[PDB]
Design a protein around this ligand. Structure first.
Ligand code: NI
Lengths: 147, 146
């Protein structure tokens, strides 16, 4: 059975919510150099930051003190991922770890901010009304603040 | 700083295994290794219950949702204990000590659940027949898929 060596701390399971940090990976692709796979992994980890944000937005929407009036489905939450991702700013690649067994490339990233006006417009463009958008964007703003 | 002899199950990427859970307890002077493992194992088991709650929340928010009752995030959080209590045949599959943080991690897998116990627990927290029956069905589907 299988154990891994030289594993950085951020690769490990842990209880700790760095909502604006993302860890994710890319598998290898024949004909793509490892550096290319690191780029893909870094983008995937950045999408993961957006996924982390959407998760917090669903919980807020489900809360007894939700103020969003529009009905927002799970599928709509999933759709929010792209506009949130598109709005992320100043995202730093903090680390790379490669699993030598399958050569899967993991990236650690941190998004230092987001563009509230870009996020607003993206959310409008997926048919969320202005009351819903205002609350959603304010929530994302709190997440960056609290981070 | 780097960690050595890290088992696969300790990596960050295990969301797909809804019925598996990992969590830890801190090594403290005055506690026996066995009390510490027991706490980590309990916590790992609570993580399985939380994994299940998250799937229920997603199913409830889906456009396909047929549960008519209003269920709040706080109510979903409240479902964690009845789900935990209903878990059956929860096997401890590993222990890992992190020497950097002095944390003992446990890996568990729940092989199943008691749908009657879960029902009774959900009924006690004021979920209606329709909600309980559907939530229970969804948990059954999670275990079937596992
Ligand atoms: Ni418009």
């Amino acid at each position: 059975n299988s154990f891994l060596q030289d594993v950085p701390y951020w690769m490990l399971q842990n209880r700790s919510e760095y909502i604006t940090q993302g860890v994710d990976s890319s598998h290898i692709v024949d004909g793509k150099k490892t550096e290319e796979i690191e780029k893909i992994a870094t983008k995937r980890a950045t999408i993961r930051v957006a996924q982390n944000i959407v998760h917090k937005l669903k919980e807020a929407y489900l809360s007894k003190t939700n103020r969003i009036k529009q009905k927002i489905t799970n599928e709509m939450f999933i759709q929010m991922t792209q506009p949130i991702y598109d709005s992320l700013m100043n995202v730093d690649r903090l680390g790379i770890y490669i699993n030598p067994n399958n050569e899967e490339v993991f990236a650690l990233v941190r998004a230092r901010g987001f563009d509230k006006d870009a996020l607003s417009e993206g959310l409008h463009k997926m048919s969320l009304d202005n009351q819903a958008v205002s609350i959603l964007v304010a929530k994302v703003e709190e997440i960056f603040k609290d981070s």
